[PDB]
Ligand binder design. Structure first.
Ligand code: 7LY
Length: 313
């Protein structure tokens, strides 16, 4: 009887509704061809348009093993549907509060996935501008994926010039706020009034607790430079000693999930399902229109790395 869930329910089986906040709620669901669990961000357009499409059109052109992958895309008459990677681990935010502060070791593993994500985003020419621990999840395998692109509670991680409206280096500051929140358990510049914080952010003076490594403070000092030209570049960030402390080899920000290389095993299987020549489907898949076929393929080689047999229904 669903009037708007026509197309969706033809390709997915609905499950437990999550995310309820009027503006958007995410319901997990099962891709029936692949039997693979997905999350679907449901938004009606009665409660904006461009900010969302700026996120979706970004996500259309970025693929990376630490960005929450976007599959099919669907727009109803008064609704919009986005299916994305399954991220049951939850926010890194709650993961922070789970165990008070985070060890330098544990903070190092989380953070290097973050830089590899953000360093790849910058290669393609985008900046996320809104980096908060509420915007990065854990997949089924404790890998980290970033969401809520949108811009391409959110002021504390904002760079000084981002409040000045005066360009990728705003994230290097945001990641510096992240790391401080990671190893400790609190923010560099927070307080109850927004007026006082603007002052503290432009002032750039923040405390430094007991437990922090002499290697950390250096890195944060290079990251929390109100001078964006004196802020540390992404190039030096990928080779930095704190980042190469134990885990000792360059941050592999190179996307291992490509727009260019189509896995044969998945495309051979996909062609027998549609009754096409394999060469015919390969070019068709490379369109990446983010309709059903793209969802089927990208959850098929995902099913492959999952270890499952590469089958449909
Ligand atoms: O599948 C997602 N989340 C998710 C799935 C299962 C469970 C949990 C969470 C909470 C842990 N215990 C219950 C199991 C999931 C995947 C992608 C996106 C997403 C991708 N772009 N934008 C949003 C959002 C998702 O959720 C939203 C969420 C809900 C509660 C907190 C944190 C996050």
């Amino acid at each position: 009887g669903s009037k708007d869930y026509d197309e969706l329910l033809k390709y997915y089986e609905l499950h437990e509704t999550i995310g309820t906040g009027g503006f958007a709620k995410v319901k997990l669901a099962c891709h029936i061809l692949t039997g693979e669990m997905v999350a679907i961000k449901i938004m009606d357009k009665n409660t904006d348009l461009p900010r969302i499409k700026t996120e979706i059109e970004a996500l259309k052109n970025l693929r990376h093993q630490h960005i929450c992958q976007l599959y099919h895309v669907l727009e109803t008459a008064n609704k919009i549907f986005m299916v994305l990677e399954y991220c049951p681990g939850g926010e890194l935010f709650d993961y922070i509060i789970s165990q008070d502060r985070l060890s330098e070791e544990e903070t190092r593993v989380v953070f290097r996935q973050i830089v590899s994500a953000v360093a790849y985003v910058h290669s393609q020419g985008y900046a996320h501008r809104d980096l908060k621990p509420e915007n990065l999840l854990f997949d089924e395998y404790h890998k980290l994926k970033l969401i809520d692109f949108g811009l391409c509670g959110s002021l504390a991680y904002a760079a000084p010039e981002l409040i000045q409206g005066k360009g990728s280096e705003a994230d290097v500051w945001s990641m510096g706020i992240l790391l401080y929140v990671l190893m400790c358990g609190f923010l560099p510049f927070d307080d109850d009034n927004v007026m006082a914080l603007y002052k503290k952010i432009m002032r750039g003076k923040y405390d430094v607790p007991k437990w922090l490594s002499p290697s950390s403070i250096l890195l944060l000092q290079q990251m929390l430079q109100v001078d964006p030209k004196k802020r540390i570049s992404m190039k030096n960030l990928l080779n930095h000693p704190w980042i190469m402390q134990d885990y000792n080899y360059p941050v592999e920000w190179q996307s291992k999930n490509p727009f260019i290389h189509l896995d044969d095993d998945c495309v051979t299987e996909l062609s027998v399902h549609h009754r096409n020549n394999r060469q015919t489907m390969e070019d068709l898949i490379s369109l990446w229109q983010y309709d059903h076929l793209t969802a089927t393929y990208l959850l098929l080689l995902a099913k492959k790395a999952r270890g499952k047999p590469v089958r449909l229904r």
